[PDB]
Amino acid sequence: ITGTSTVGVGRGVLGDQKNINTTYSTYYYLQDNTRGNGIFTYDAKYRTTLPGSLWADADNQFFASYDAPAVDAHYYAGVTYDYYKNVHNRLSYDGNNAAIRSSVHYSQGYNNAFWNGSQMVYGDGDGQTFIPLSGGIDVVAHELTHAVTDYTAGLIYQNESGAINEAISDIFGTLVEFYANKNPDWEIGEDVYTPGISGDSLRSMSDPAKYGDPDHYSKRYTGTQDNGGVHINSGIINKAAYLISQGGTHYGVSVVGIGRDKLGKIFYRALTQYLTPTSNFSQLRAAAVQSATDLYGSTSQEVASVKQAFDAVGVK
Ligand SMILES: CC(C)C[C@H](NC(=O)CNP(=O)(O)CNC(=O)OCc1ccccc1)C(=O)O
Ligand SMILES: [Ca+2]
Ligand SMILES: [Ca+2]
Ligand SMILES: [Ca+2]
Ligand SMILES: [Ca+2]
Ligand SMILES: [Kr]
Ligand SMILES: [Kr]
Ligand SMILES: [Zn+2]
Secondary structure, X not given: OOOEEEEEEEEOOOOOEEEEEEEEEOEEEXXXXXXXXXXXXXXXXXXOOOOOEEOEEOOOEEOOHHHHHHHHHHHHHHHHHHHHHHHHXXXXXXXXXXXXXXXXXXXXXXXXXXXXXXXXXXXXOOOOOEOOHHHOHHHHHHHHHHHHHHHOOOOOOOHHHHHHHHHHHHXXXXXXXXXXXXXXXXXXXXXXXXOOOOOOOOEEOOOHHHHOOOOOHHHOOOOOHHHHHOOOOHHHHHHHHHHHHHOEEEOOEEEOOOOHHHXXXXXXXXXXXXXXXXXXXXXHHHHHHHHHHHHHOOOOHXXXXXXXXXXXOOOO
């Protein structure tokens, strides 16, 4: 909408207060004009018709329980935009400052979030499996990263390419969580998953097997559920990424860590310059090796560590 940029204040899903960029024109809308061509957050009103209505508020204060998922979807989309711009010199998901749209209060008791090809969509959860999923910065960044993937490598959402697609979203979701630097970890979704159970999460990158997912190619799933295991076999790539960053010895193979920043540079370059819609795990290894070679040199530690990490998870 046309209006003037304003600054509201509210509380997110976890009860934390934060400022949000809004737009005033009769109402205060969740429209952040400070980033690209805007970040826009919508109310889906417990229905499934998208996007719903641009979020309107009478007083620029967003402290109601109903407001909390919107506050966080809006704010964490901003953090994610900032990460891609400041760290990777990428302007929004398309690289040309496309408007970023999210809808919250999608459906009833909806235990998921997704990119629908055009926007992000967040359920509220059923209150037992999840609380509203936009409360997780890693989840928000995971979802927006699907848009980045779709505009770049275009990894098909099934089988190995789809597991790479998922892992890219978990990797950058985690790197955004570290960028914001509030309780960062290598787990996915811990802030919104199972409010009655402490210390768990949806997936672990450091130890995928803790939540049932493979950590070696010899344990990959090859059935048909979950689009051929895209959220399952992502554990193999997540583990490789974790080892590149943090190091470790895994199934007897030692990896010298190179840190999160270099992990992000290598995988961002692989995603945007080498991966294709049909890339498989072996092709991802080759893309990561080439990316690290471009950035750091063929004789570098970074190249050697990428190779060690993929060796450790059984990907040649
Ligand atoms: C319990 C769940 C939270 C776990 C998992 N989801 C995630 O980890 C995050 N959402 P996501 O990975 O973005 C969904 N992915 C998803 O819904 O993919 C289908 C689609 C394709 C094209 C258009 C619209 C939807 C899942 O879906 O099993
Ligand atoms: Ca209000
Ligand atoms: Ca965390
Ligand atoms: Ca996390
Ligand atoms: Ca929990
Ligand atoms: Kr982005
Ligand atoms: Kr997620
Ligand atoms: Zn995903």
